[PDB]
Write a protein that binds this ligand. Structure first.
Ligand SMILES: Nc1ncnc2c1ncn2[C@@H]1O[C@H](COP(=O)(O)OP(=O)(O)OP(O)(O)=S)[C@@H](O)[C@H]1O
Ligand SMILES: Nc1ncnc2c1ncn2[C@@H]1O[C@H](COP(=O)(O)OP(=O)(O)OP(O)(O)=S)[C@@H](O)[C@H]1O
Lengths: 624, 85
């Protein structure tokens, strides 16, 4: 009767129909049974990485016993699930734990070998009751004679951290290696599990959902194992769909929540006795109106759809895989097809010229959302080089902004400090046993979180010619391994290597300097090797416009603006001389010609905030 | 890409070949007598057969070349065997 108090009954629940169906894994249950019915030392231990199904096998064995598919020796055996947590509950005295253990062992032995105990995560049995080794090995005499059977299951690396350190007890256990299944098997598993979820959430599930989940959960989420990271997607999709069968769907409930906040802000900002908050209000109202338009449009379209979405499909799974591990995995639902077709002209707002290199980046971004590029290879690996001041770093910063709306979201490393060979260790970590080890790598541990960024290697030509080799595997496929032995995936980042070889020689001399500075097997990894071009006087007026736009945007903090005459706008670009320093002289000239005079006149009255100022050319300089 | 490493990891591999054993910190001897050991490389880079066979000999030691089985040499791609790739 001690059992009734210190353990539950598994076979009883299997009869009462409370365990999930178990599909496949025939070899494993066969081996478990045949080990479980031998003469001496019959103690199978299911071992293997976490998630691949190790409790599911024991539940399958229980349902199999209830059914009758077992051999003769295992008829009516009444599996029992032990519990060592509720056994050490209150035993602060000297013998209170050994007493309970002896009672349970005696009642297991009194039965005619019927009971089949089952300790889940038996790596906790080692130090059961400590004080001096006495407890947890009182069963060691009964294991050998095979009186109690004890099918248990622990993870693969808590078996050599807790048990293998006890070689006298490992001897009494037989290991059953449970390897993870493939996609074709996971699909079959899901096809039989697609009823409990479909009934718990009042929805229906298409078979395409199962297929797409079992595929995407293997392609993207490279940190868990397969029978589980595929069930999670299905489960979350179903829960979301049931949440939307409530009153309103998403994308209407978000816009109404935004509108309410904008309203409650505009209602309480109106009574502000100020003049600078007048413009800080003049935009809030416009925003509220332009959002209420969208709300009304969505609400009307819902009415049409409802007078003229009830099962999960192969794209809601993509929405989940995008919301978790923010890699975009969708199918271009018309929100951004226009954007990806406008990409070139949109990156033109910040970068000017070098269409030969803008088109090359845009094409690599584009043919990956359409699902055409190599799924196991980086999303693109370019090294664009050319003379200075031309805009290579600028294009790399414009791309990250166009993609994530925050230029500080990309991962940037400056390869000008890696001049010494030994300085490699700061991006792959330090081996075990050395000073900085628990911190892990640095590039690795940044790409391991949010693996959608853009990676930038400035001035690649200045690092020692031995950091070039840590990038071979990184460019050819997405793998790089830190100290702890974990591996990160680069398969969906966009690498970029800005350089400066062959300052202004030719488009042929620079291709003869690259081939002498790099190795034949390293150039072979790259995509197109883009070459940038010097700037023309006609490409420079637009840069003047950009600089003035930025300066005005910065000045608008103090409520100013400038009226620049076209004579001055062309004078500035006329003084952007010397196509040997690119386009920085323009910046320093704008400073030395406008910023200093503006400061002068600004911190001495006469240009008080508010009113704008005009700028006009003079004989030589330009005055205000 | 084995020739890119430091010539001490070779000496670690020295007993993996020819015996299939190496023991870690915990003092557990691990056996390799059933694996298939494969080492790629890119030495020589164009030498016919003895600009490469003598560039292996000057980067590795005889006691390391001696454990190996045949040192396979790969060959460039003819125009015919690309219409199939
Ligand atoms: N062969 C299978 N048939 C049916 N369901 C399975 C199968 N393998 C795994 N599952 C399900 O996938 C999940 C796997 O969970 P478990 O296998 O119980 O966890 P585990 O594999 O024991 O890993 P730990 O170490 O116990 S956390 C559960 O939801 C199971 O129901
Ligand atoms: N085509 C361009 N379009 C817009 N701004 C440009 C362009 N070319 C240069 N600029 C400006 O020039 C600044 C400096 O150019 P960068 O590209 O940062 O220098 P670089 O191209 O990296 O050359 P090096 O070798 O790195 S010094 C940028 O911040 C821009 O403001």
């Amino acid at each position: 009767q001690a059992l009734q108090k210190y353990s539950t009954d598994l076979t009883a629940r299997a009869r009462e129909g409370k365990l999930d169906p178990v599909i496949g894994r025939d070899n494993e249950i066969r081996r478990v049974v045949q080990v479980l019915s031998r003469r001496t030392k019959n103690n199978p231990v299911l071992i293997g990485e976490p998630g691949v199904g190790k409790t599911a096998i024991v539940e399958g064995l229980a349902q199999r016993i209830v059914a009758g598919d077992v051999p003769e020796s295992l008829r009516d055996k009444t599996i029992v699930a032990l519990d060592l947590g509720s056994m050490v509950a209150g035993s602060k005295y000297r013998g209170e734990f050994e007493e309970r253990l002896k009672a349970v062992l005696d009642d297991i032995k009194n039965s005619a070998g019927q009971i089949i105990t089952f300790i889940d995560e038996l790596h906790t049995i080692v130090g059961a009751g400590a004080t001096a080794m006495d407890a947890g090995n009182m069963i060691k005499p009964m294991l050998a004679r095979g009186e109690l059977r004890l099918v248990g299951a622990t993870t693969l690396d808590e078996y050599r951290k807790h048990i293998e350190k006890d070689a006298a007890l490992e001897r009494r256990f037989q290991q059953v290696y449970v390897g993870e299944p493939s996609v074709e098997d996971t699909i079959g598993i899901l096809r039989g599990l697609k009823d409990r979820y479909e009934v718990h959430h009042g929805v229906r599930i298409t078979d395409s959902a199962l297929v797409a989940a079992a595929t995407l959960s293997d392609r993207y989420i490279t940190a868990r194992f397969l029978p589980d990271k595929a069930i999670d997607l299905v489960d979350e999709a179903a829960s979301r769909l049931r949440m939307e069968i409530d009153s309103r769907p998403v994308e209407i409930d978000e816009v109404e929540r935004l509108v309410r906040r904008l309203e409650i802000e505009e209602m309480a900002l109106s009574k502000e006795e100020d003049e600078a908050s007048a413009e800080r209000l003049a935009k809030l109202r416009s925003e509220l109106a332009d959002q209420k338009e969208k709300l009304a449009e969505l609400t009307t379209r819902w009415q049409n759809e409802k007078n003229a979405k009830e099962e999960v499909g192969p794209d809601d799974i993509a929405d989940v895989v995008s919301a978790w591990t923010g890699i975009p995995a969708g199918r271009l639902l018309e929100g951004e097809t226009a954007k990806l077709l406008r990409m070139e002209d949109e990156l033109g707002k910040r970068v000017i010229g070098q269409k030969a290199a803008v088109t090359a980046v845009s094409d690599a971004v584009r043919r990956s959302r359409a699902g055409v590029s190599d799924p196991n290879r980086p999303t693109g690996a370019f090294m664009f080089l050319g003379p200075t001041g031309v805009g290579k770093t600028e294009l790399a910063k414009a791309l990250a902004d166009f993609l994530f709306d925050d230029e500080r979201a990309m991962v940037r490393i400056d390869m000008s400090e890696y001049g010494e060979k030994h300085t490699v260790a700061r991006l792959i970590g330090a081996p075990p046993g050395y000073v900085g080890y628990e911190a892990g790598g640095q590039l690795t541990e940044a790409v391991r979180r949010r693996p959608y960024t853009v990676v930038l290697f400035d001035e690649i030509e200045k690092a020692h010619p031995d950091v070039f080799d840590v990038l071979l595997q990184v460019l050819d496929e997405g793998r790089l391994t830190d100290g702890h032995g974990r591996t990160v995936d680069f398969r969906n980042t966009i690498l970029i290597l800005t350089s400066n070889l062959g300052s202004g020689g030719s488009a042929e001399q620079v291709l003869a300097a690259v081939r002498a500075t790099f190795k034949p097997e390293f150039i072979n990894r790259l995509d197109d090797v883009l070459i940038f071009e010097g700037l023309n006087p006609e490409e420079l007026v637009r840069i003047v416009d950009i600089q003035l736009a930025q300066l005005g945007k910065r000045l608008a903090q103090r409520r100013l603006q400038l009226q620049v005459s076209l004579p001055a706008k062309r004078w500035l670009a006329q003084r952007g001389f010397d196509p040997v320093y690119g386009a920085r002289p323009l910046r320093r000239l704008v400073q030395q010609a406008i910023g200093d005079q503006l400061a002068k006149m600004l911190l001495a009255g006469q240009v008080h905030d508010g009113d704008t100022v005009p700028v006009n050319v003079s004989p030589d300089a330009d005055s205000l």
